[PDB]
Paper text:
BRCA1, a large protein of 1,863 amino acids, contains an N-terminal RING domain and two C-terminal tandem BRCT domains. Abraxas mediates the interaction of BRCA1 to other components of the BRCA1-A complex, which include BRCC36, NBA1/MERIT40, BRE, and Rap80.
The structure of BRCT domains in complex with the 2p Ab (Ab2p: GFGEYpSRpSPTF) was solved at 3.5 Å resolution. A notable difference between BRCT-Ab2p and BRCT-Ab1p_short structure is the conformation of the Y403S404R405 region. Extra electron density corresponding to the phosphate group of pS404 and the side chain of Y403 is observed only in BRCT-Ab2p. Unlike pS406, the pS404 phosphate group is oriented away from the BRCT domains into the solvent region, thus avoiding contact with G1656, L1657, and T1658. In BRCT-Ab2p, the Y403 side chain is positioned to interact through a hydrophobic interaction with BRCT P1659 at the N terminus of BRCT1 α1. There are eight copies of BRCT-Ab2p in the asymmetric unit (ASU), and each BRCT-Ab2p appears to dimerize through the same interface either within the ASU or between ASUs. Dimerization involves α1 and β2 of the BRCT1 domain and the Ab2p burying about 1,880 Å2 area. In the dimer interface, two of the α1 helices from each BRCT-Ab2p complex form isologous interactions burying a hydrophobic patch formed by F1662, M1663, and Y1666 with aromatic side chains stacking on each other. The negative surface patch, generated by the phosphate group of pS404 and side chain of E402 at the N terminus of Ab2p peptide, leads to cross interaction with BRCT K1671.
Numbering used by the authors:
A (entry chain I): 401 to 409
B (entry chain A): 1646 to 1859
Write the structure that this text describes.
């Protein structure tokens, strides 16, 4: 289902 | 026994991961979702010029001097039905610190002279989008000495203490401006570490310094 996006900096 | 291949991927949509998982399956490559000391390769999503976004796996990959290569390595292997050489696909830069700063490459070539050599770093919470113990691990891999609490700093002429905080993470308080009153050490933003790691070269603190109250 949902896709927590990978945290980008 | 020799070290074995162990990968983590970053910045990929699930569908891309599944393609890699099928890839990892066919050529019997170890593939994990969490990066460890045993992890040897970090696969980043890049553009045509091998430029990626800055992710946690991206920083940790560089800190460990591990091979950081573009996702195009997989798709190309599919296109030609061979296992081409990854080294040809090493990422050249990122969208923050430069498109060709050759950070990952330099990172591999300098483990004898790590960038945070001779530094004692305290990651003073809180933090967002990046666990404290992972950031602590990051500077460890770069030769820094991790300090859990401000009072635990070594007192000496040879020691270089540094307090690193993330102003974004503070929401209840304006407390990061008062740290200079509690200890004898410079206070800089998390971006100092991130930039230093990405270029794998120790940046000047001047621009990353956080103003204190005397």
């Amino acid at each position: 289902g949902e896709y927590s996006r990978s945290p980008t900096f | 026994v020799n070290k074995r291949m162990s990968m983590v991927v970053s910045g990929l949509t699930p569908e891309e991961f599944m393609l890699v998982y099928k890839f990892a399956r066919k050529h019997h490559i170890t593939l994990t979702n969490l990066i460890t000391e045993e992890t040897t390769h970090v696969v980043m999503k890049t553009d045509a010029e091998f430029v990626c976004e800055r992710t946690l796996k991206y920083f940790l990959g560089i800190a460990g001097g591990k091979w950081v290569v573009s996702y195009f390595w997989v798709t190309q292997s599919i296109k030609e039905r061979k296992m081409l050489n990854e080294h040809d696909f090493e990422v050249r830069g990122d969208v923050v610190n430069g498109r060709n700063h050759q950070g990952p490459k330099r990172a591999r070539e300098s483990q004898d002279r790590k960038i945070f050599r001779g530094l004692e770093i305290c990651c003073y919470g809180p933090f967002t989008n990046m666990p404290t113990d992972q950031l602590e691990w990051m500077v460890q891999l770069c030769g820094a000495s991790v300090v859990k609490e401000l009072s635990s700093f070594t007192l000496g002429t040879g020691v270089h203490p540094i307090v690193v905080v993330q102003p974004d993470a503070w929401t209840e308080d304006n407390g990061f401006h008062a740290i200079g009153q509690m200890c004898e050490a410079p206070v800089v933003t998390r971006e100092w570490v991130l930039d230093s790691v990405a270029l794998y070269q120790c940046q000047e603190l001047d621009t990353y310094l956080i103003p204190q109250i005397p």
